[model samples]
Target: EIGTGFPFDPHYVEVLGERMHYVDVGPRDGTPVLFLHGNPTSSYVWRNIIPHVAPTHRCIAPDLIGMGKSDKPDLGYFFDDHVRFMDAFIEALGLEEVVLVIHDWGSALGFHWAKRNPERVKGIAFMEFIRPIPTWDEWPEFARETFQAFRTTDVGRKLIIDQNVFIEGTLPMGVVRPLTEVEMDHYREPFLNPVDREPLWRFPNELPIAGEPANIVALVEEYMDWLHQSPVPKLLFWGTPGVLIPPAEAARLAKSLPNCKAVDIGPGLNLLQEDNPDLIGSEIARWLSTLE
Candidate 1:
């Protein structure tokens, strides 16, 4: 049901203590292109992008751990936990020569593994990628205010847990156009009840508003270093006023990566895929062409 607009079959990979779902399309002999999405979105996020590129390559997008149609096991959904599941997914499938396409937490997990196993990677394309600064004090005032809600015991609980404000309000944020009922339902239906939504509630507080998750903070720095130094071809599609990385910071990110290509795909926010999936898809498709 969630795969309505997606033109591919769902396949299951049992790993990370759950049966993770992925959309694996294109001919077996085709090049493997793996797309990884972040929090609150599943493989469905790439629905609009895959069709554009699948004709020439194998497009595979997985529901990271507990998101999407994947099993909602009570894993804490920490950064490391996600990496473990993703690593297992790669291993279990014997995936090789993978071109990584990551966004949000997808960048956190995918880059973690890609930086470690750069040999197996052909290239990478990302949008709205996550890059954590050394301190929460440096985050934008708006970001601090937004993520601070996730740190507070009361506010965080109501926003992400008790009432699930993430679905009630967060998903629709920054979208100039409203989604159709079918599309909206695909996002909201998975966590309609409190019990079915622990995965959403357990996402890592990378911002660590009150204090810090020292392990995640360290991991982010390590991966950030990789992003800065990886010799692999990397393409970045950024929004106008990105939630995680602003224009100035995006410039810094491009400056840091010697081989990185940055394209401002126009106005949007954190939920960029919601507003500019078409442009996001087209730009990525065009980039993938050069990799060929």
Candidate 2:
């Protein structure tokens, strides 16, 4: 089992058409805090934070289908596909209430689900994620080249699918500290071959950079409505120099939400999990304490 040396018990439940695995730690009856991770990362991203909040909160991190320990079928791994599998996964788990801790595509999935099942969600904690891209031209030069290539067929497959440059190069750039070989193994181990790396190739393409993925564009519209209208407590754990959500947009996001607050965790970038899990975990725990 890949569960070796982790802080929490890795458990599996049947979701969609396969066995999906998750890290279900903390209390049986404590407040359910469902942690959702994005591409190329897993519940392993929470390996550091779970230990901090497990004593007082119920922290659940599920690996989205076709990623991490979750079963990868021969599906297209599109946004719709992930949402389909996730919809089944959520219903099967049957948690009475949920507080979402999401990053990257995790936010995209969570927001769409929450919009439909808004009552199930108590609050949301998010950091370093893409929001509504009104215009691809408006995106910062820093990310344009990367997203452009990822959407390109030959070039994307070269980087994301075949070479697995996402793991070897891109992932390391987000964090401030160097990932130990063992830590890298946890993230890199699941997608050991191309057949398994199918999800990674699909993610950036969902970026809707030339208005390609119709379903994603529609879903983002719906979720944007939810983000603005939803009255639940929303926490945006930001960094000093965040990568995806720029400071200007981050300010706008703060004002857009009916009940949203931003917390700067200091000196971190995109993958704040690796750079500031202790601070992220503690800050979240403190914020949850307010809700309770």
Best by TM-score, which number?
2
CA deviation > 4 Å runs, candidate 1: 1-4, 135-137, 174-176, 208-211
TM-score of 2: 0.94
lDDT of 2 by residue, 1-292 (tens): 1122465556899876598989887788766898889877888888887777788998888888888878879888888888888788778888877899989889888888889988889999999875767676766666678778888789998899999977887787777778777788878888888778878888988874555577787788889787888898999887767777777767888888878888777776678888888888888898889997
For each candidate in turn, the TM-score is 0.91, 0.94
What is the RMSD, in Å, between candidate 1 and the native fold over all Cα?
A: 2.6
- Model 1 earns a TM-score of 0.91
In terms of lDDT, the poorest run of 10 residues in model 1 is 202-211
Candidate 2 Cα errors over 4 Å, as ranges? 1-5
> What is residue 122's positional error in candidate 1, in angstroms?
1.5
